[PDB]
């Protein structure tokens, strides 16, 4: 019920060819090529693209699919002229961005993260204690829950970094966090958890997305 200040969500309407579901490095590299200043930013995160799943491991862009960027509101003039109205290419297809819209950062009792990556922690217990430690670093109190598939197993996801010729394997979990109160909820949403925040992972969304991801 509290709208966070100093942090907004720059949302660009996204359209183009069907896109891989594990975009990650693809989208980040395309934006970096379009926007050189995006590489050197620190407290910025890119939202997972919202669109229905298509065949293979691809993702199809809808009219409701939009590229959303979480950024300090004073740092917008550093990336706005490079992104607003410009076009970026993923592979061989051209994708166009229009004038973005600003969305305030709303507080929620229960927040959700698609994907949390912590270096060197692969098992569930070590991952959970690592996220507890990360909460302790930023002073947030809450209960950690892990998203589960239809079988109840904790969910794992993989991030593919195609740096140079070799391709890289970086993996993490998808958590659901509640019992946060609005102030700490906003603090967690702005700061995020884990690493690879610009890498389409580590950011937090309300728990409606948590249930939606739990569906499929």
């Amino acid at each position: 019920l509290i709208q966070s200040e100093e942090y907004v969500d720059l949302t660009f309407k996204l359209r183009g060819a069907p896109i891989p579901l594990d975009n990650g490095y693809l989208t980040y590299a395309a934006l970096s090529r379009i926007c050189p200043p995006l590489h050197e930013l620190k407290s910025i995160g890119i939202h997972p693209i919202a669109g229905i799943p298509t065949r293979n491991n691809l993702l199809e862009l809808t009219a409701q699919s939009r590229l959303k960027i979480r950024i300090y509101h004073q740092q917008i003039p550093l990336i706005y002229p490079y992104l607003a109205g410009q076009a970026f290419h993923i592979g061989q297809n051209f994708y166009q961005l229009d004038i973005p819209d600003y969305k305030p950062l709303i507080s929620s009792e229960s927040v959700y993260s698609r994907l949390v990556i912590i270096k060197g922690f692969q098992d569930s217990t070590n991952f959970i204690e690592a996220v507890q430690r990360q909460m302790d670093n930023l002073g947030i109190q809450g209960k950690i829950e892990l998203l589960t598939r239809q079988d109840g197993t904790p969910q794992r996801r993989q991030l593919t970094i195609n740096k140079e010729g070799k391709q890289f394997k970086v993996r993490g979990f998808g958590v659901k966090i509640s019992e946060l109160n609005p102030e700490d909820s906003l603090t967690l949403q702005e700061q995020g958890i884990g690493g690879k925040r610009k890498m389409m992972c580590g950011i937090f969304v309300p728990a409606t997305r948590s249930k939606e991801e739990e569906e499929t």
């Binding site: 229905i52 199809e60 809808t62 009219a63 409701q64």
Partner: protein, 109 residues
């Protein structure tokens, strides 16, 4: 039978529900003793539908219209197939179906 017309019919149904929701929102917008028009709302919707110039226009228009339609159940159990129908098919056919839905909307209220 021949579920193409099933998709056509439930598209008409969710369009009628969405336009009912938008008319309710307009009813919320107006105030005081001024009579909230009903026929003028339909005329405005038709004019806005005819205002488009293919593809981008009328596709984001009708998606935004359905989004402002509100809590539409028939939309909720028919998200994926209606999205597929919208992504496919010519846009003028979608406009024809929408206009037919407008012409056959009233008996809801």
């Amino acid at each position: 039978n021949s579920e193409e017309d099933k998709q056509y019919l439930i598209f008409i149904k969710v369009f009628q529900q969405a336009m009912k929701g938008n008319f309710a929102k307009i009813y919320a917008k107006t105030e005081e003793g001024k009579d909230p028009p009903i026929k003028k709302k339909v005329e405005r919707l038709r004019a806005e539908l005819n205002y488009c110039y293919d593809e981008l226009s009328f596709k984001e228009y009708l998606s935004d219209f359905l989004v402002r339609g509100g809590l539409n159940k028939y939309f909720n159990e028919h998200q994926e197939e209606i999205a597929l129908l919208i992504k496919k098919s010519p846009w003028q056919e979608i406009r024809i179906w929408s206009l037919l839905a407008i012409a056959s909307y009233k008996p809801k209220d």
